[PDB]
Every structure is written in structure tokens, then in C-alpha cells.
């Protein structure tokens, strides 16, 4: 049985070779698992939320890495907590944030240009853009963006010790417990939505609201950052800068970057009951991992799956999952990726890797996939 997950040799090309639509793998600690690799079967498993549980608190729930063996919407509260958050992620709300996002993107590209050719785009642009956008989504005031960017970078850089990362988490938790006491006082940001819902229902504690805000930061930061960095590397390889600069094409270019990069490579479930997926017999308690990256390269819905093609038709990719746990932030993540890539390649059309692609350095198998650094000239 092959190991899952494996290290990406090239960080913007997922580890494939897995048989479809279902195959047997071994997790890091030897636990057997069904890996779901077909696109249709991916959707079926993610939609069948009673049979395929994401209850991380249940003892059968599979860990994909040692570091994650040792925040999240618990099952009884899930639909209520999700409905709370979704009111802060309307299409109108994201459209309203676009001007703020392009201001954040431009001020970080000012810093890229100030430093000059040789700059690491990860530390200066790809990591900071999505933490500062989450600042603006939450209502974190401009004066505190530097502190918040710095502590969220400590968690996500994947260069800090487990202790340095726990420290940074605690600082952001402290900061947000302070800030939320000032919210619901005329603002329309995510922290005001949460206060207004607590004030209206009286059944949510302020610590639970801080936990929900930290969940958004953790779900929305490294994922968006790593799909932005990998997007840039992939566009530079494909000579695709110019298409990303095109305001009519950047939406479709971003869908194709999401399909390719699938930075949340797999999501874990466990069977709560005996079932069958594509004829395969699944016992209650069995690990079931949905390989979103592999579902995204199923040659049925995505013929010529490995080619970069923004014009691609057919079914939606599952980079953001599907069904009742589908990415709440998907619309915000698209807007962010579109404005960041559009403004980067308009301002710096001659952008190029300052080292060979083979020297970018990938992240570890277990976590959000990505590069450690992205040095660039123009
Ligand atoms: C490129 C960016 C992103 C990727 C690849 C991504 C990926 C995912 C995936 C695969 C899921 C489904 C988890 C599962 O089924 O087990 C998910 C859920 C979620 N995402 Fe995202 N995401 C992105 C951006 C964001 C952003 C920007 C936010 C918030 C600001 C966010 C917040 C969440 C939340 C709260 C959930 C949980 C929803 C639930 O369980 O009901 N994500 N994301
Ligand atoms: Cl150090
Ligand atoms: Mg456990
Ligand atoms: Mg520099
Ligand atoms: Mg893929």
C-alpha cells in the first residue's frame, strides 16, 4: 500500500499516480485508509456528511501527520456556527472589500519594489496579503495590522518551533479578546456580526467568538498564501503573467490555479457505518481521506488534466471541498487571488524567478502544500 501523503517534488504539481476512483493507502503512523481520488466519488463522500464524519473529536478521526495527532466547529454546533460566519461572507460583502483588498495588495507591492530585485515574494507579499485581508474582514484597525501580520506569519511561515507557533497563537487570541469588547458599536465587519449574533441569541460566549475569529485566520491564511505563491511560480513556468494581468481572464486563471495547486491536498473523514463507494466495501471506523488534488486531475471531468488551461470547461474543481463543510471563504479567497495576481503582473510584467524552480524548497507532506520562499527579479 502506498504512503499518503507524500512530499511534492515540485510544490505546484500534486503527488499523483494513485489509482481511481478509490485506492488503499497507509497514513504516516501506518493506519490503513481509503483514498478517494475520483472527482464524482470525491463529491459523493463530501456530500454524505452523516456516513463520512469530519468530527475531529471522535477517536476514529484520522490524523494525516504526527504534528496534528497532538478550534473548529464541533458537530452539534456546526450548522449554527457556519450560518453565523456565512452572513459575513456574502457576495455583497466581498464586492465591498475589493477596493480595500487592492489597497492592501498595492501597499505590499510598494514594499516589494522598495526592497527591489532579489526580494523573497513569500515574506514580502504572498504571506502578508491574506493575513492583512483577514484583518480588514474582521475589523482589525490599521494601527494593529503590523502586529497581526507578524504573529500570523510566525504560525504559518513553517519555520517557527511548535512553541514559537503556540506563543503567536496565544498573542493573537489575547489581542482578539481585547478587540472584540469594542465591537458591535456601529461596525459591519466580521467581529461586529459575531457580537450582534451573541447579543441577539445570548447563547454564545465571548471566548467562543474569539475562537471563531481565530478559526477564520487559520483556515484563510496559509491556504490563500500558498495558492498565491504557487500560482505565481506556475504562471512564471507557463509564461502566464500576461493572462493573470488581464481583468477579463484573471477569474478563470484563478480557477485553474486552484484546480492545479489544491493546497489542502486531502481532507480526512471516517465511516460512521458500513458503506460502499464505487463498489469498495467500507467498514464503520475506517479512515476515508478525500484527495482533492487527485479528484482535480480525474481525466473524466478534466481531460488533459496536467496542462495549465484557463479556458477549461466542465465541472467545478473540489479545491474548496463540496457539500456541508465547503469553504466559507471561497469567494473572498478568489477576490484576493485575482487582485494580488492582477496587480503583481500589471506592475511587474517582467517578473522572473531569481533562482531555478528546482531550488524553491517545498513544504512537508503533512500540512498546507506550498514553497518556503519565492525569490524574484524583474
Ligand atoms: C486558497 C484558499 C483556500 C483553500 C484552498 C481552502 C480550502 C478549504 C477546504 C478544502 C475546506 C473544506 C474542509 C473539509 O471538507 O473538511 C475549507 C473549509 C473552510 N474554509 Fe477554506 N480555503 C481557502 C480559503 C479560506 C478563507 C480565505 C477562509 C476564511 C477567511 C476560509 C475558511 C474556511 C472555513 C471556516 C471552513 C470550514 C467550513 C465548515 O466546516 O463548515 N477558507 N477550506
Ligand atoms: Cl531561529
Ligand atoms: Mg485522535
Ligand atoms: Mg530584500
Ligand atoms: Mg490537482
Residue numbers in the entry: 11 to 80, 88 to 395
How is this structure described in the published paper?
The crystal structure of AbyV reveals an asymmetric unit comprising two molecules of the polypeptide (Chains A and B), with Chain A accounting for residues 11–395 of the full‐length protein and Chain B residues 27–395. Electron density was not observed for residues 81–87 of Chain A and 73–94 of Chain B, consistent with the assignment of this region as the highly flexible BC loop. The overall fold of AbyV is typical of a cytochrome P450 with a large α‐helical domain (helices B–L) and a smaller β‐sheet region. Surprisingly, the region corresponding to helix “A” in other P450s forms a loop in AbyV, hence our assignment of the first helix of AbyV as “B”. Each molecule of AbyV contains a single heme group situated within a large solvent exposed active site pocket of ≈1600 Å3, as calculated using CASTp. The heme cofactor of AbyV is coordinated by the side chain of residue Cys344, with a single water molecule observed on the opposing face of the cofactor, 2.1 Å above the heme iron. Each of the two molecules of AbyV that comprise the AU contain a single molecule of PEG bound within the enzyme active site. Our crystal structure provides no evidence for the presence of atypical catalytic features in AbyV such as those reported in other P450 enzymes. To explore the likely enzyme‐substrate interactions of both atropisomers of spirocycle 3, we used molecular docking to obtain initial positions of 3 near the heme group in chain A of the AbyV crystal structure.
Using a combination of synthesis and in vitro assays we reveal that AbyV, a cytochrome P450 enzyme from the aby gene cluster, catalyses a key late‐stage epoxidation required for the installation of the characteristic ether‐bridged core of abyssomicin C. The X‐ray crystal structure of AbyV has been determined, which in combination with molecular dynamics simulations provides a structural framework for our functional data. Abyssomicin C is a spirotetronate antibiotic produced by the marine bacterium Micromonospora maris (originally Verrucosispora maris, reclassified in 2018). It is a potent inhibitor of bacterial folate metabolism, showing activity against a variety of clinically relevant bacterial pathogens including Mycobacterium tuberculosis and multi‐drug resistant strains of Staphylococcus aureus. In summary, here we report the first structural and functional characterisation of the enzyme AbyV and unambiguously establish its role in abyssomicin C biosynthesis. This cytochrome P450 is responsible for epoxidation of spirocycle 3, the penultimate step in the biosynthetic pathway and is key to installing the ether bridged core of abyssomicin C, a structural feature critical to its mechanism of action as a substrate mimetic of chorismate.
